[PDB]
Amino acid sequence: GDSEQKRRKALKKVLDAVEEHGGTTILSTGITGDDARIARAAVAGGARLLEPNHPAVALARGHKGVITMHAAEQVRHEIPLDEMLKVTQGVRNVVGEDIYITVGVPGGFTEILPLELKEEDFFKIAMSGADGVHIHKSTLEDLKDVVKYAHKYGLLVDAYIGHPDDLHTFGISARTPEEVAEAAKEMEKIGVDMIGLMTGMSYEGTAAGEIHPVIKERLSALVSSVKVPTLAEGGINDTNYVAFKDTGVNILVIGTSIDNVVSEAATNVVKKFLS
C-alpha cells in the first residue's frame, strides 16, 4: 500500500546513513532540527537524519522566556502541534526527500500534562512531511497505541528506554542491563522501528574520553538484543563520541553539543565585529 511503500523508503534512508557512516551515524537535533537555515547547514556537513522537537522549538521561540534546555523541557507541551507541523514541513521543503526527519511533538513524549494524540494527529504529521515520530512514552501500552497510528499513516517510530529513577521519564524503564535487553526485545516485538537508550547521565569519576561503565554496559545490552537500528540519546559530545561509537550503537542523537558550538560561533563573531 501507500503507507507501506512510504515506510520502506524511510527505513532505507536510515539504513543507508548507517552504512555510509561506517555503522554509526548521527540523528542531528537541537537547532539543526528546527531551523531551516541550520538544518541545511547540518546536511551540508553530512547529516542524513534530522530531529525537530518541541523543547528545541520552545527555545527557538523564546517561549515563556526559557533559556535552557531544562527549562524548555518543562514547557514543551505548551508548543502547539501545528507549530511542529510547520517546522517539519519547512525543514522538508529545504532538505528535500532524501533526508530522514523524525519529529518530537507535544504528546509524543511522556508529558507533564496529559496531552492525548489522536489518530488525526498522526495523519497531520505524515502530511507535514515527517518520516517518523521521536517517541519518549514510558509504558509499553502507550507505545503500542503510538506504533499502531504511526504505522497506519506511513511513519516510523524511534522510541527509547530509560531508568525507573529518572526524575523526568523519557522512556520504557529498565533498572538493569538485563531489563534493558528485555525492554528492547518487547519494543521490537511491538513493532518499534528503531530503539534507543537514554545515555545522558553524568557520572562522577568518568575517565576522560570514555563513557561511564554503567552506561556502556546498558548500551551493550541494547545493542546486542535487537535487530532494528539502535540509538543512544543524551550526553554525547566530541570527547566521548568515539567511545559511544565503539559500542556499536547505530545512531547517536546529538543536539546540545551542536547547539553549544553554533551558539558560541555566533557569540564569537559578534565579539569580533565589536572589538
Q: Which of 21, 148, 151, 216 binds a second copy (CB under 8 A)?
A: 21
Q: Is 134 assigned a ligand-binding role in the annotation?
A: yes
- Judged by CB under 8 A, the stretch of 6-14, 41-49, 110-118, 141-149 that binds a second copy is 41-49
In sequence order, what are the beta bridge partners of 157?
A: 133
The Cα diameter of the chain in Å comes to: 61
Footprint of a second copy on 71-130 (CB under 8 A): 86-87, 89-94
- Judged by CB under 8 A, the stretch of 134-142, 160-168, 189-197, 237-245 that binds a second copy is 237-245
- As measured in angstroms, the least distance from the Cβ of 274 to a second copy is 4
Q: Which of 23, 62, 80, 213 binds a second copy (CB under 8 A)?
A: 62
CB closer to a second copy, 67 vs 208: 67
CB closer to a second copy, 169 vs 240: 240
Total number of residues that touch a second copy (CB under 8 A): 59
CB closer to a second copy, 61 vs 216: 61
The reply on whether position 15 binds a second copy by CB under 8 A is no
- As measured in angstroms, the least distance from the Cβ of 57 to a second copy is 10
The C-alpha cell at 235 is: 550526553
**Secondary structure of the chain as H, E, C letters:** CHHHHHHHHHHHHHHHHHHHCCCCEEEECCHHHHCHHHHHHHHHCCCCEECCCHHHHHHHCCHHHCCCHHHHHHHHHHCCHHHHHHHHHHHHHHHCCCCEEEECCCCCECCCCCCCCCHHHHHHHHHCCCCEEEEECCCHHHHHHHHHHHHHCCCEEEEEEECCCCCCCCCEECCCHHHHHHHHHHHHHHCCCEEEEECCCCCCCCCCCCCCHHHHHHHHHHHCCCCCCEEEECCCCCCCHHHHHCCCCCEEEECHHHHHHHHHHHHHHHHHHHC
Cα separation, 271 vs 160, in Å, equals 40
| 202: Cα separation from own chain's centroid | 19
The reply on whether position 254 binds a second copy by CB under 8 A is yes
Asked whether 33 and 56 are in contact (CB, 8 A), the reply is: yes
CB closer to a second copy, 104 vs 162: 104
- Judged by CB under 8 A, the stretch of 109-117, 169-177, 214-222, 245-253 that binds a second copy is 245-253
The reply on whether position 246 binds a second copy by CB under 8 A is yes
The reply on whether position 216 binds a second copy by CB under 8 A is no
Q: Is 77 assigned a ligand-binding role in the annotation?
A: no
Q: Is 20 assigned a ligand-binding role in the annotation?
A: no
- Judged by CB under 8 A, the stretch of 5-13, 54-62, 150-158, 221-229 that binds a second copy is 54-62
Return the residue matching grid coordinates 528485555.
182
User: Residues within the annotated binding site?
Assistant: 134, 136, 233
Give the residues lining the site for a second copy (CB under 8 A).
21, 25-26, 28, 31-32, 35-42, 44-47, 59-67, 86-87, 89-94, 238, 241-242, 245-246, 252, 254, 257-259, 261-274
User: Residues within the annotated binding site for Mg(2+)?
Assistant: 134, 136, 233
